[PDB]
């Protein structure tokens, strides 16, 4: 809740990479838990957690798209704190998504 | 020729004379031992000359003499250097201990450098060489001899990158380059060190190398103009597409313009092998 | 590792034994008049303690032991060893506590200059100026120390060393926006260095700086100074410096800031510029 520091890791599996969920160790968090990741005072990025046994405690595995969007590097230190939504105001009704072929 | 037999017989006679003189129980015995060891050295009997030198050093140290004792210990160490490296290491360790006791740190650092050299060249051991080089660098930096410390740190970082993890190499290269940029005479070479550091980051991951090169380019504007910066940017782009042919073409072109250290070749081969 | 704890413990034990020895030395002297053997032995223990502390990386303890030994051996009327230990403190406390090293080096300088050994005093003054410069921006004290060292070296007739001190003083003074001293020092050193066989090649550079330092004053005197320098050192014309100054003067004569900036950029591209030159050029461009 208050936020803890740890080291970013690489996404363990292709399925979890496609899930777009930050892969965590069961000992650290739980599947479905939601967090805010601080990399600096001006850099906060919002993630949803999913547990995987292979994750080492004290680390979170992120996919390449997640690393690029959040600018996270394997081995870098980051803080992360559990974040709770205000479902009465933050629940999503409509999403406009820009789509393109991932590979030319 | 007459030299071998004559000098050997004279050395044995002098050793026996010194042994008899001590049997009477003293500086005369030490002088005889030193002369006999010298003749042994002329006779090419490299072995057993260090033995006589060590005996003389012990006899002289018996009477509280330390300077000449240390000099003769170092003499025996270098004499055994070719005949028996291990006893040379031991004699040099003794001399280093005594010299550090009196606080002549430059002599101790030089002897540590020699010990690391003999350890790395004749015997096969890197960790002992790394430790000795680090000790010599610490001694010199305590004596504020910047050039020698930089040389030792560069060697240690090179070996650590060669076998050990890259964090030590990253740290040493970054520190040395940062110290080197400001220097008026040495500024021109700074690029090199930085470049090396970046390559080590690549061995870990491409994104770490990208962030490191971005930080270096920001810190050192001249680095942007370096042909090295362009080469790494091109290589990183080629790697990001899992395209080995571009990797090979860029490496070959750069080698064509300028020859390779054979260290860059090793690192580039390692990086290429892991491109998959 | 074992080094830290072991060296610390043995050094504390030895220092406590030395303290007990000096405590009992007064009683020994009063009851028997043993002389200075006890005091000399205590000084030996203290010097060994300082050296071990230096080995143990505990610089503060080594400096304290060195200062104690300096004081004790000075009490024995041995000013040479006392000054040696004062310089030991100056070089040991240098990193642990720069301020203490300052006063230690002043004491050593006073002792040395008492005997007229001016070279050592000048070296210590240079070290103190370096200490002032590296940490503090208190430029004035550095300038004073450098001037004193240069004067001492000139009084020792050892040329080519006072020269560098004068160059440092002039370069630092030029930063303070006081240009007459910089101009005078630069021109004096340049005129001295024209005639040297080996140094001749470098002489031109000095003139350049002077002219640039003469540029902030006003354009016209800079032009006339360029003429004066060129007539005296015709080879100066060949150097790129004269071409660059002429181009900059022509650009500024018509307020053509763009041409001046382009010329500066081109020259920097050919050869990277120094921070001092960059600052001087920026200050000139303000006009």
Curated annotation (Swiss-Prot), chain A:
Subcellular location as annotated: Cytoplasm
Physiological role: Required for vesicle-mediated transport. Catalyzes the fusion of transport vesicles within the Golgi cisternae. Is also required for transport from the endoplasmic reticulum to the Golgi stack. Seems to function as a fusion protein required for the delivery of cargo proteins to all compartments of the Golgi stack independent of vesicle origin. Interaction with AMPAR subunit GRIA2 leads to influence GRIA2 membrane cycling.
Naturally occurring in which organism (per UniProt): Cricetulus griseus (Chinese hamster)
Domain of life: Eukaryota
Residues of the full protein shown: 1 to 104 of 744
Protein name: Vesicle-fusing ATPase
Protein family according to the UniProt entry: Belongs to the AAA ATPase family.
Subunit structure: Homohexamer. Interacts with GABARAP and GABARAPL2. Interacts with GRIA2. Interacts with PLK2, leading to disrupt the interaction with GRIA2. Interacts with MUSK; may regulate MUSK endocytosis and activity. Interacts with CDK16.
From Swiss-Prot, chain C:
Compartments reported by the entry: Cell membrane
Transmembrane segments: none
InterPro entries assigned to the protein according to its UniProt record, in alphabetical order: NSF_attach, TPR-like_helical_dom_sf
GO biological process: apical protein localization; brain development; intracellular protein transport; membrane fusion; neuron differentiation; positive regulation of ATP-dependent activity; protein-containing complex disassembly; regulation of synaptic vesicle priming
Any single Gene Ontology cellular-component annotation: presynapse
Residues found modified as N-acetylmethionine: 2
A GO term, aspect molecular function: soluble NSF attachment protein activity
Top-level taxon in the UniProt lineage: Eukaryota
UniProt keyword annotations, A-Z: Acetylation, Cell membrane, ER-Golgi transport, Membrane, Phosphoprotein, Protein transport, Transport
Bilayer disposition of the protein: Peripheral membrane protein
Positions of modified residues (Phosphoserine): 27, 30, 196
Function: Required for vesicular transport between the endoplasmic reticulum and the Golgi apparatus. Together with GNA12 promotes CDH5 localization to plasma membrane.
Entries under PANTHER family matching the protein: ALPHA-SOLUBLE NSF ATTACHMENT PROTEIN, SOLUBLE NSF ATTACHMENT PROTEIN SNAP
Subunit (UniProt): Interacts with PRKCABP, and disrupts the interaction between GRIA2 and PRKCABP, leading to the internalization of GRIA2. Found in a complex with VAMP8. Component of a SNARE-like complex that contains at least ZW10, USE1L, RINT1, STX18 and NAPA/SNAP-alpha. Interacts with VTI1A. Interacts with STX12. Interacts with GNA12 (via N-terminus); the interaction promotes CDH5 localization to plasma membrane.
Similarity remark: Belongs to the SNAP family.
Protein name (database record): Alpha-soluble NSF attachment protein
Lineage: Eukaryota, Metazoa, Chordata, Craniata, Vertebrata
């Amino acid at each position: 809740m208050a936020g803890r520091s740890m080291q970013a890791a690489r996404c363990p599996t292709d399925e979890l990479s496609l899930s777009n969920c930050a892969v965590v160790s069961e000992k650290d968090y739980q599947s479905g838990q939601h967090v805010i990741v601080r990399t600096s005072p001006n850099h906060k990025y919002i993630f949803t957690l999913r547990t995987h046994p292979s994750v080492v405690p004290g680390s979170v595995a992120f996919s390449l798209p997640q690393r690029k969007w959040a600018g996270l590097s394997i081995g870098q230190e980051i803080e992360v704190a559990l974040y709770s939504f205000d479902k009465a105001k933050q629940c999503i009704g409509t999403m406009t998504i820009e789509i393109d072929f991932l590979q030319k | 020729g007459m030299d071998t037999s004559g000098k050997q017989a004279e050395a044995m006679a002098l050793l026996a004379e010194a042994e008899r003189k001590v049997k009477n129980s003293i500086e005369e015995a030490c002088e005889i031992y030193a002369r006999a060891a010298n003749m042994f050295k002329m006779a090419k009997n490299w072995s057993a000359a260090g033995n006589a030198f060590c005996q003389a050093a012990q006899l002289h140290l018996q009477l509280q003499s330390k300077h000449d004792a240390a000099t003769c210990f170092v003499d025996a160490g270098n004499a055994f250097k070719k005949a028996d490296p291990q006893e040379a290491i031991n004699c040099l360790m003794r001399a280093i201990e005594i010299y550090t006791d009196m606080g002549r740190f430059t002599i101790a650092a030089k002897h540590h450098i020699s010990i690391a050299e003999i350890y790395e060249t004749e015997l096969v051991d890197v960790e002992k060489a790394i430790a000795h080089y680090e000790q010599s660098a610490d001694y010199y930096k305590g004596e504020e001899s910047n050039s020698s410390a930089n040389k030792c740190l560069l060697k240690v970082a090179g070996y650590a990158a060669q076998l050990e993890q890259y964090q030590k190499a990253i740290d040493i290269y970054e520190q040395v380059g940062t110290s080197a940029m400001d220097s008026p005479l040495l500024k021109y070479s700074a690029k090199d060190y930085f470049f090396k550091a970046a390559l080590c980051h690549f061995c870990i991951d491409m994104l770490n190398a990208k962030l490191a090169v971005q930080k270096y380019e920001e810190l050192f504007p001249a680095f942007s103009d370096s042909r090295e910066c362009k080469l790494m940017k091109k290589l990183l782009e080629a790697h990001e597409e899992q395209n080995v042919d571009s990797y090979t073409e860029s490496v070959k072109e750069y080698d064509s313009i300028s020859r390779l250290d054979q260290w860059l070749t090793t690192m580039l081969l390692r990086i290429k092998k892991t491109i998959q």
